[PDB]
Amino acid sequence: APSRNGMILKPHFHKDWQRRVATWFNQPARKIRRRKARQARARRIAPRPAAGPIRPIVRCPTVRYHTKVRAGRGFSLEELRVAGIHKKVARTIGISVDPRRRNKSTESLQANVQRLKEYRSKLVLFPRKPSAPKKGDSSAEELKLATQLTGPVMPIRN
Amino acid sequence: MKFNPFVTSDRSKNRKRHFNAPSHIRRKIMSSPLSKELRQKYNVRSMPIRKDDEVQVVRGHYKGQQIGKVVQVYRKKYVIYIERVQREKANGTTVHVGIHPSKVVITRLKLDKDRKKILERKAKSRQVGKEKGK
Amino acid sequence: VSELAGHQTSAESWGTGRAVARIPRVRGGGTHRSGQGAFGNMCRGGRMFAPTKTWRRWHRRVNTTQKRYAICSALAASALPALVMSKGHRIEEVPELPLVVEDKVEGYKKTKEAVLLLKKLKAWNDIKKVYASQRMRAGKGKMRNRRRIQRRGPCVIYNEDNGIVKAFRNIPGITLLNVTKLNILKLAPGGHVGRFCIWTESAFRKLDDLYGTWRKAASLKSNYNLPMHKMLNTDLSRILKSPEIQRALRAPRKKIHRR
RNA sequence: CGACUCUUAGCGGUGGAUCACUCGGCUCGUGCGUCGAUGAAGAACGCAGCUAGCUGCGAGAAUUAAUGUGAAUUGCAGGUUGAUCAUCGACACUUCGAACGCACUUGCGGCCCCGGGUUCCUCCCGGGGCUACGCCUGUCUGAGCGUCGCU
RNA sequence: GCCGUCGCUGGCAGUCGGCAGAGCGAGAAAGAGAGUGGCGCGGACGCUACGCCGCGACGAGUAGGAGGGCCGCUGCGGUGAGCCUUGAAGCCUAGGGCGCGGGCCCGGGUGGAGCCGCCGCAGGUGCAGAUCUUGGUGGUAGUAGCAAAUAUUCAAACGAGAACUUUGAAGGCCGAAGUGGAGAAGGGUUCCAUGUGAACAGCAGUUGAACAUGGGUCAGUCGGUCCUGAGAGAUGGGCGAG
RNA sequence: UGGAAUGCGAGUGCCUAGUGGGCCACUUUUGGUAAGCAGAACUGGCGCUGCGGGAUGAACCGAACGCCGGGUUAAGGCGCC
RNA sequence: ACGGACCAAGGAGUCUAACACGUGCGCGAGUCGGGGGCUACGAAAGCCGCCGUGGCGCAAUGAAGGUGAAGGCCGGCGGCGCGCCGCCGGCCGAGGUGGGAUCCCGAGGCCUUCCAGUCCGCCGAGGGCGCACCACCGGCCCGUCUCGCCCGCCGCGCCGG
RNA sequence: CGCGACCUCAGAUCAGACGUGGCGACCCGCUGAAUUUAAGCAUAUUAGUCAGCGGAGGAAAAGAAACUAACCAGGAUUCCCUCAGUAACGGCGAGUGAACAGGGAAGAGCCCAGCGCCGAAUCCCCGCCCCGCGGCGGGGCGCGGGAAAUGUGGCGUACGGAAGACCCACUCCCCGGCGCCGGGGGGCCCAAGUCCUUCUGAUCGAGGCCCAGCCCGUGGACGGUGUGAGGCCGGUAGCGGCCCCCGGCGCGCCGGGCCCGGGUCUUCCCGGAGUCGGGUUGCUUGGGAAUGCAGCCCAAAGCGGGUGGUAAACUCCAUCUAAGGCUAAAUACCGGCACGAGACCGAUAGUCAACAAGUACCGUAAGGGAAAGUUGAAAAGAACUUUGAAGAGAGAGUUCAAGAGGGCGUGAAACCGUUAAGAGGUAAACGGGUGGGGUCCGCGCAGUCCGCCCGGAGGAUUCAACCCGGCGGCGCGGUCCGGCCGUGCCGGCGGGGCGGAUCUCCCGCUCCCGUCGGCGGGGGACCGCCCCCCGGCCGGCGACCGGCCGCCGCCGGGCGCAUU
Ligand SMILES: [Mg+2]
Ligand SMILES: [Mg+2]
Ligand SMILES: [Mg+2]
Ligand SMILES: [Mg+2]
Ligand SMILES: [Mg+2]
Ligand SMILES: [Mg+2]
Ligand SMILES: [Mg+2]
Ligand SMILES: [Mg+2]
Ligand SMILES: [Mg+2]
Ligand SMILES: [Mg+2]
Ligand SMILES: [Mg+2]
Ligand SMILES: [Mg+2]
Ligand SMILES: [Mg+2]
Ligand SMILES: [Mg+2]
Ligand SMILES: [Mg+2]
Ligand SMILES: [Mg+2]
Ligand SMILES: [Mg+2]
Ligand SMILES: [Mg+2]
Ligand SMILES: [Mg+2]
Ligand SMILES: [Mg+2]
Ligand SMILES: [Mg+2]
Ligand SMILES: [Mg+2]
Ligand SMILES: [Mg+2]
Ligand SMILES: [Mg+2]
Ligand SMILES: [Mg+2]
Ligand SMILES: [Mg+2]
Ligand SMILES: [Mg+2]
Ligand SMILES: [Mg+2]
Ligand SMILES: [Mg+2]
Ligand SMILES: [Mg+2]
Ligand SMILES: [Mg+2]
Ligand SMILES: [Mg+2]
Ligand SMILES: [Mg+2]
Ligand SMILES: [Mg+2]
Ligand SMILES: [Mg+2]
Ligand SMILES: [Mg+2]
Ligand SMILES: [Mg+2]
Ligand SMILES: [Mg+2]
Ligand SMILES: [Mg+2]
Ligand SMILES: [Mg+2]
Ligand SMILES: [Mg+2]
Ligand SMILES: [Mg+2]
Ligand SMILES: [Mg+2]
Ligand SMILES: [Mg+2]
Ligand SMILES: [Mg+2]
Ligand SMILES: [Mg+2]
Ligand SMILES: [Mg+2]
Ligand SMILES: [Mg+2]
Ligand SMILES: [Mg+2]
Ligand SMILES: [Mg+2]
Ligand SMILES: [Mg+2]
Ligand SMILES: [Mg+2]
Ligand SMILES: [Mg+2]
Ligand SMILES: [Mg+2]
Ligand SMILES: [Mg+2]
Ligand SMILES: [Mg+2]
Ligand SMILES: [Mg+2]
Ligand SMILES: [Mg+2]
Ligand SMILES: [Mg+2]
Ligand SMILES: [Mg+2]
Ligand SMILES: [Mg+2]
Ligand SMILES: [Mg+2]
Ligand SMILES: [Mg+2]
Ligand SMILES: [Mg+2]
Ligand SMILES: [Mg+2]
Ligand SMILES: [Mg+2]
Ligand SMILES: [Mg+2]
Ligand SMILES: [Mg+2]
Ligand SMILES: [Mg+2]
Ligand SMILES: [Mg+2]
Ligand SMILES: [Mg+2]
Ligand SMILES: [Mg+2]
Ligand SMILES: [Mg+2]
Ligand SMILES: [Mg+2]
Ligand SMILES: [Mg+2]
Ligand SMILES: [Mg+2]
């Protein structure tokens, strides 16, 4: 029995909702648990970045969002072929790779190739054996100065 | 305050762990301080009492400067019985009045090998704490 | 209260006739609980009216600007002389009420040296008041791990922790606060404003970096200015007996005219 | 002033309300997240010097061994080269029960090996190990006017 | 005369004091206003301005609405250099009282260990009823009742105590399809001895199927065990999401 | 010369409980023999309301109500109760 | 008429979500970290702005394709019959009427011995700018209906304004 | 007919293994209602819900597009915010109701069949030797037995792959053992008063501990001890100590497997069938000319097939590779073990169960299912005398208290007994008003004080006024000197930190022939705001002062002498 004036309303409480009530009192404990797991991963991979491998400069679909730029799933195979990095070497040196992506635009292709060229210069590759370094390894002055990068590595700014 | 998240600061749980403790924890709880002379000599603050110890009663009705031998240590009622600390029943028999070991000081220790080992370990821990404080 | 409390018993109502009060009663049996009455808030045992739920709205959020206004008011009332004594602090022997101490207070690591610092600052009367007002809690809170109660003492705000927390936490009454992590619940205990605080030099200099003046914005925060005064000259007595207002007034009609 | 009845007060009985205590619940959060044919869950029956219930245990039966602890358990008696406690990693774990030799009466079997009986001569008694269904790999024995090769 | 409500959005910061001049109840729009030429150190209360004070009128109330509670219960953050084994809470009171009232404070007794005032916060927060739920207790009421199947009497013994126990004698009944002697199902120590009279045996009991200590069921032939009946129920097979 | 008398501070916007069974009375009046019957019009009461009177009394007459003292009436009465 | 021997204890508009209105606070054409991340009480608190993504509000309307919230005046030129339409340069540039609390101007006067006479206040005839708000008249945008005339070209059209 | 193979099917108490059942809070697959609402009810709704059934794990499931979109395109799965109570479904009624994208937590990719190359290059079991044997593994020796061509292993899987030729550059990846150096579980310990008086039955109560303001405190959480304890005890805090067990990060050695990559050119190859899809029916979905699943019938194709939220034909496009499989993480947990906390409950409350609780008891059974805490600090649980047969008492005794006496803390009301007082034929009881009698209270019973003055009797080392020192108030000192501040303003041959959608020598990248144009970053110049030095006004010190000076008041010490 509605009164004088008010909004029409459809409360979705006609089911037995009280059995399925997800209380959110686990929330600060889960914040502590995510924090401890993230610090555990950061202590596990000691020179590597705590965030992870780098993620591409990505245009958005669906015309509401295409002015904005995201961080994507991984680099394209044509991007890796132009930059000169093998797709199995890239996963080992800390580069996100996905085979599903295409390259229709040339400008975003050149931008991700340039970001690969910047990341190859910024990368400090440690040798496999410390006693016997190889040809493609970093210098001994860089071995001591190399450390973690807090936050996302090369944060994509619009 | 306490900062260990596993140490209980709950009244009912602490009373449960007290009144339902097994006998080796009953012995640890039922401990008594040593005298000033024995404390200066051994550098030991307190020890668990034994059946063959000497006691001056500090608090209660039977307190004084009377050094009495322990009759036996009754850990079920958390009590000890002392030789001259007793009273007369109605019929005439003497019943040892129970004294809790917290109101009990030791004038002479009964020293066996395990007793000397516990005293040396407590003196060693006291010396380590004193060296860490220095 | 658990949802199964009262509903574990199966109880069909006896109907009408039987000259019973039309209540769901326990289905038979050769025991005391047989035809007794299980469901309903008024029956012995069973359920109560309105079982308290886990999904009660326990938590209330406050706007960030209101939180910062509460912090600024709780800090600003800690400088006025009357508002600190109206909280209750014995401050008669304290040499200056904005008590700013040197940066050697973070260097202390001993409670004996902290007590000696409180003696030399002559704020020990508040801690002795806390010792005198350690008493027993009234009611059923004693069996709910709230046995001993005492008075809150002087707060101490530190910038860096170099043993100041270890030196000052064992003295009963003193709450320690960091400069960037000031709390409303500790700056204003019980909703009453003007708790006595003890600042260090770096903590007293860092407040202008935190909140700024009215012409300089917050350097550490993103966008926060000081709140605006509704009136500047809050002393209305000097406003009332001023030559500007008292010229353009009428005559006071103070003659009492009775019937 | 009588007896009986009504009201108030002191006291004494029926009764256990109120208050104060709480080795208990309820809620929330954390870590672990593990049963069983090498016999689970559960059930039955026994086990204490005096022992009904609870608790613990399995004919080694309120416990065995090992480690740590270091003079007791106790209601009453009895007796430091380790009593009592906790951990428990070794040993043991009656009968049903997925329950397993077929049935559930605690009944009836079958095979092999030991000791009384024998002097392997068959019974009888006692002890021990097997004997549930389905299915996987391999082995053995087989069946087929199924497909063939030789005489 | 007193209480409360409403209105005058009435009045009060003017307690302006040898740094002074003590007022704006008075029928009459507006100043106890500035200028320039012709001895004795003195004066009650006030004003938690969410307070104080003065005028007038008004005062019923169901359902219902709103406001004030320095009315009451429980817990929390503060606070009272709070109370307390030289006596806390609870309870009783022919005592002293206060408030319109909700209720509250002291005096006396009991009690033995916690409790309360103020500012806020929160609720499982106030009972006279619901043929309300639980527990307890009255009138009825020392009342209805201890009335189906013929019947008991005397003496002695144990014992503190005898209508009921035991023995003897007398008189009766069930009158061999029994009130007799034995079984099945079911009961499970009820069977037997010794002791008790706390509780039960709707009176009593020295008695009992009650209580507490102890004992008692001996099989090749008596049954089960074996067989099959009416039937039940595995294997193969079929069906079925299971 | 606020263009009759008299009286009174007015206008306006939200949110909104309860109610949606009524009854009685001077006058008018429908149906019915009539009804303490059923159904209407105006207004007032009861409902929601105590008080004095009608001995008694939900509606009649008077008169509406904070707690009291002095006086005075209404409606009714002044043999006794 | 129903419930009700008596007494003690328990006992009935609570909680969550959504919406409306009123009030208090903070910020303000902005507001909000609610989700995430960083630093005993503390599971609290503080912080993030290239974590304001996103919600709500600042723009509505149409079923949709879509569209989307003042104008006036002067000069010059072209067309048509001093008047109208179209195209370029400067100015005025955010509606009006009435009721409107408050504010502004001040014809005059507010007294101590008569006139002259400056400054501070104070009241007021009468005249104004007019807050909010109310009632109306106008104006603008959008969908729809009627009457007709012009403008533009990358594609001269069943085009667009 | 006999012998020997293969194929199908048997029998084994054959040798070696596995499954059965339980718990089930979370998870997966089925099956699956009616209450209720629509103010009736039948579609709907409750609701893929309750109940029923099967199956695991510590998580399960899902999962690396036969995807979303139509944009300058994103890119496995899972979970949160938002999309959004929206698109949509619905007697278009009641009601139901997603997905994309964006921000995050997490982030990890892959393997087969086919197609093909390699002497089956492959796998299991048994005999012997060496190591290790409580997760039965590694190597060697066997004309040992089988599996497998009706196809095991290596390369290889949609991101292309294989083979051949030509260039470039390395020779270190994994498994199983032995020893050595430097978080988890268990056990034992580590500070300070029982200090002097005073209460008490007992202190943990109260006072003090002076000049080291009793001692410790990285320990003033909690619990016990004869009420209330930082210092009596267990503990508490501590990058505190000691002794065992376990795993991991590394080093050194032994036995092995492996002879492994990338770019360019040439030649070949490439895909999952009663499956997709269509018709029909039933369930389901927001999915509406049918989203998904299932039953029947038809039944494919290879520049093919699926999707592109309105059925169909033509036409270009966009985007994936279905009909095979594996995979942690973020996610869920009212069951279990070990824990921690509480603005909760305080024995009719909180779980049914604080206690011999799923117990006693009831029902043939499935099932139903209670009530029940408190002596005291310590049993110190009442010796002994006496009446009674005893239950019961009376003395005596313990305890602070028996007015705490074995269902005993406190002991209310209803009800009952006794004593005291008052009363009694309109049932009792009540409201207003008095009267009388009792209980105690006013510790009443010659009755309250407070200022000024007069008069008579007394007593101080004292009044006013001066001297010195200190403190306080004010100062329009008309306008003293000096500091501080301003939610007030300026000036600068001043030095800086932020912000800006104000402009323009060095470094990096690609395109073109050391040069010329493009993009980004860093200086550099411009403006706004702020900080610090100055120089000058205004204003304040009455949320914010120093020194003298002048006045007043107060305090302390000197005097001053009794008509004060
Ligand atoms: Mg309504
Ligand atoms: Mg991330
Ligand atoms: Mg610790
Ligand atoms: Mg309950
Ligand atoms: Mg209380
Ligand atoms: Mg009680
Ligand atoms: Mg009870
Ligand atoms: Mg037994
Ligand atoms: Mg042993
Ligand atoms: Mg041992
Ligand atoms: Mg049989
Ligand atoms: Mg009136
Ligand atoms: Mg009223
Ligand atoms: Mg009474
Ligand atoms: Mg006590
Ligand atoms: Mg509550
Ligand atoms: Mg009641
Ligand atoms: Mg009689
Ligand atoms: Mg009779
Ligand atoms: Mg018979
Ligand atoms: Mg017989
Ligand atoms: Mg017998
Ligand atoms: Mg009887
Ligand atoms: Mg069958
Ligand atoms: Mg009605
Ligand atoms: Mg009606
Ligand atoms: Mg009528
Ligand atoms: Mg009325
Ligand atoms: Mg009336
Ligand atoms: Mg009459
Ligand atoms: Mg009349
Ligand atoms: Mg009168
Ligand atoms: Mg009369
Ligand atoms: Mg009736
Ligand atoms: Mg009725
Ligand atoms: Mg009745
Ligand atoms: Mg009650
Ligand atoms: Mg409404
Ligand atoms: Mg509002
Ligand atoms: Mg076998
Ligand atoms: Mg299973
Ligand atoms: Mg319905
Ligand atoms: Mg209905
Ligand atoms: Mg119906
Ligand atoms: Mg459904
Ligand atoms: Mg189910
Ligand atoms: Mg498992
Ligand atoms: Mg899985
Ligand atoms: Mg997606
Ligand atoms: Mg929305
Ligand atoms: Mg319709
Ligand atoms: Mg649905
Ligand atoms: Mg998305
Ligand atoms: Mg192959
Ligand atoms: Mg794929
Ligand atoms: Mg204590
Ligand atoms: Mg003391
Ligand atoms: Mg303590
Ligand atoms: Mg102390
Ligand atoms: Mg200690
Ligand atoms: Mg210690
Ligand atoms: Mg269905
Ligand atoms: Mg459906
Ligand atoms: Mg198409
Ligand atoms: Mg596939
Ligand atoms: Mg697949
Ligand atoms: Mg906590
Ligand atoms: Mg109880
Ligand atoms: Mg009880
Ligand atoms: Mg109780
Ligand atoms: Mg209960
Ligand atoms: Mg009791
Ligand atoms: Mg007592
Ligand atoms: Mg008592
Ligand atoms: Mg007590
Ligand atoms: Mg009692």
DSSP string for residues in C75-117: HHTTSSHHHHHHHT---TT-S-SSEEE-TTSTT---HHHHHHH
Is C133:C151 a contact under the CB 8 Å cutoff? yes
Q: Is the CB of C71 under 7 A from strand G?
A: yes
Number of Cβ within 10 Å of residue B49's Cβ equals: 20
The secondary structure of residue C169, as a DSSP letter, is S
Separation CA A74–CA A90 (nearest Å):
11
Instruction: Say yes or no for a CB contact (<8 Å) between C143 and B10.
Output: no
The secondary structure of residue A30, as a DSSP letter, is H
The residues, any chain, with a CB within 8 Å of residue C74's CB and separated by 6 or more, are C184, C187, C188, C193, C194, C195
Separation CA C54–CA A25 (nearest Å):
9
DSSP per position, C213-253: -SSS--SSSSS-PPPPPS-S---HHHHHTSHHHHHS-----
Separation CA A92–CA A48 (nearest Å):
12
Q: Any bridge partners for residue B110, and if so which?
A: none
Strands B54-57 and B104-108: antiparallel
Residue C152 in 3-state DSSP? coil
Separation CA B53–CA B110 (nearest Å):
6
Is C14:C22 a contact under the CB 8 Å cutoff? yes
The residues, any chain, with a CB within 8 Å of residue C123's CB and separated by 6 or more, are C91, C93, C94, C99, C154, C196, C198
Separation CA B55–CA B32 (nearest Å):
10
Separation CA C132–CA C151 (nearest Å):
9
| Chain B residue with minimum CA distance to C166 | B1
Residue C138 in 3-state DSSP? coil
Q: Is the CB of C32 under 7 A from strand H?
A: yes
Q: Which residues of C touch A21 (CB under 8 A)?
A: 54-55
Token output for A67:
């002015």
Cα-to-chain-centroid distance, residue B91: 32
Separation CA C243–CA C97 (nearest Å):
34
Token output for C203:
């903590």
The residues, any chain, with a CB within 8 Å of residue C34's CB and separated by 6 or more, are C26, C27, C28
Number of Cβ within 10 Å of residue B44's Cβ equals: 20
Supply angle C-alpha A54, A55, A56, rounded to 5. Answer: 130
- Taking the alpha carbons at both ends of chain A, their separation in whole angstroms is 54
Separation CA B106–CA C58 (nearest Å):
56
| Chain C 51-70 residues in 7 Å CB range of strand G | 53, 55-57, 61-69
- Nearest nucleotide to C32 by CA–C1' distance? H370
What is the maximal distance between C-alpha atoms in chain A?
87
Q: Is the CB of C120 under 7 A from strand H?
A: no
Nearest 5°: phi and psi at A145?
A: -85, -15
* Structural method: cryo-EM
Separation CA A96–CA A73 (nearest Å):
7
Is C191:C203 a contact under the CB 8 Å cutoff? no
Separation CA C28–CA B116 (nearest Å):
70
Resolution in A: 3.0
Q: How far is the CA of B80 from the centre of ligand 32 (A)?
A: 88
Q: Which ligand is nearest to the CA of C148?
A: 58
Residue C190 in 3-state DSSP? helix
The residues, any chain, with a CB within 8 Å of residue C87's CB and separated by 6 or more, are C192, C193, C194, C195, C196
Buried b / exposed e along B105-123 (16+ C-beta atoms within 10 A): bbeebeeeeeeeeebeebe
| Chain C residue with minimum CA distance to B12 | C143
Burial label for B50, CB within 10 Å (0-12, 13-18, 19+), is middle
How many Å apart are C225 CA and H168 C1'? Answer: 65
Is A118:A85 a contact under the CB 8 Å cutoff? no
The secondary structure of residue B51, as a DSSP letter, is T
CB-side neighbour CA atoms (13 Å) of A143: 11
| Chain C 190-229 residues in 7 Å CB range of strand G | 220-224, 227-228
Separation CA A2–CA A8 (nearest Å):
9
The residues, any chain, with a CB within 8 Å of residue C160's CB and separated by 6 or more, are C106, C202
Separation CA B55–CA B105 (nearest Å):
6
Cα-to-chain-centroid distance, residue C79: 19
Separation CA B117–CA A25 (nearest Å):
51
Separation CA B126–CA B132 (nearest Å):
10
Q: Is the CB of A2 under 7 A from strand F?
A: no
Q: How far is the CA of C220 from the centre of ligand 74 (A)?
A: 68
C-alpha pair distances (Å), C83 with each of B77, C90, C99: 56, 12, 15
Q: How far is the CA of C151 from the centre of ligand 14 (A)?
A: 44
Where does A9-97 show beta strands of DSSP type E?
57-59, 69-71
Separation CA C200–CA C212 (nearest Å):
18
The secondary structure of residue B99, as a DSSP letter, is E
Separation CA A70–CA A56 (nearest Å):
8
DSSP per position, A125-136: PPPSSSSS--SS
Is A89:A97 a contact under the CB 8 Å cutoff? no
Amino acid at site C235:
D
The secondary structure of residue C137, as a DSSP letter, is P
| Chain C residue with minimum CA distance to A22 | C55
C-alpha pair distances (Å), B116 with each of B109, B124, C46, C221, C241: 10, 12, 62, 64, 87
